[PDB]
Amino acid sequence: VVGGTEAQRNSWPSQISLQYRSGSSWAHTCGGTLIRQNWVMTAAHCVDRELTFRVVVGEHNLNQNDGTEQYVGVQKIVVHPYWNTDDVAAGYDIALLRLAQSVTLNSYVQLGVLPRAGTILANNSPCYITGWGLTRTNGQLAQTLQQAYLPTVDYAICSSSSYWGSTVKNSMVCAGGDGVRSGCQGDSGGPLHCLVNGQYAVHGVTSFVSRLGCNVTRKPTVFTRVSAYISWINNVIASN
Numbered sequence: 001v002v003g004g005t006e007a008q009r010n011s012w013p014s015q016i017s018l019q020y021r022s023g024s025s026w027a028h029t030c031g032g033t034l035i036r037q038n039w040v041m042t043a044a045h046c047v048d049r050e051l052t053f054r055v056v057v058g059e060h061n062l063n064q065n066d067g068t069e070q071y072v073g074v075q076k077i078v079v080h081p082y083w084n085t086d087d088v089a090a091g092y093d094i095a096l097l098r099l100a101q102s103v104t105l106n107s108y109v110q111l112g113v114l115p116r117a118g119t120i121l122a123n124n125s126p127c128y129i130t131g132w133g134l135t136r137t138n139g140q141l142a143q144t145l146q147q148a149y150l151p152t153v154d155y156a157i158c159s160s161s162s163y164w165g166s167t168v169k170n171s172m173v174c175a176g177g178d179g180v181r182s183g184c185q186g187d188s189g190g191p192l193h194c195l196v197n198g199q200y201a202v203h204g205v206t207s208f209v210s211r212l213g214c215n216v217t218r219k220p221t222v223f224t225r226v227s228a229y230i231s232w233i234n235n236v237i238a239s240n
């Protein structure tokens with residue numbers, strides 16, 4: 001997250017760190033959202049590589065013992081069947097991870113609430129991106145979980161020629177684009193939390209930013225629109 005602030009450690013209890021095994025260590029690669037005690041929602045592109053993955057819930061500082069973490073293996077990966085890694089602009093950037101164990105819920109570990117199917121946010125709706133991704137274009141991962149305020153940019157604006165044009169689909173949410181705040185590498189897969197009727201819900205799965213840079217004016221961060229995938233999510237969990 002570029003232009004973020006450090007989150008409070010109990011603000012975003014559905015955020016997870018998706019990590020892969022790297023020698024005798026683990027490396028953070030992506031975010032995700034805990035949606036059942038044994039299921040995480042992330043981006044498909046986060047799991048294109050043939051890596052060994054784990055999920056960390058209750059994580060605040062990637063580099064320090066928080067005293068709240070639970071570490072759990074990924075048992076099964078179900079990528080959306082229309083996903084193509086060489087066509088991120090086509091959409092379908094979503095995957096579900098079945099965890100090897102059910103995590104225990106507490107003030108640091110909670111299920112993310114998803115919107116009702118079909119819900120579309122008004123332009124300029126209040127949202128936060130969260131993650132441990134780079135804090136500058138071509139920078140380094142955050143140590144502590146970051147948040148940034150990224151108001152939505154509706155489809156008509158986002159898909160206009162000075163924004164993303166044809167690259168953005170109605171199956172996506174755009175947010176931000178102010179040139180200061182954005183998602184960045186290592187945020188992919190994580191949530192966009194939007195305040196609706198007094199409740200935050202996870203409306204987005206972080207999918208991409210511009211090849212030119214993370215915080216680029218009129219290139220808002222692009223997310224998979226969770227409300228387009230409710231039936232798919234429910235069907236995968238019910239069949240697995």
Ligand SMILES: [Ca+2]
Nearest residue numbers: 061064065066
């Ligand atoms: Ca930690």
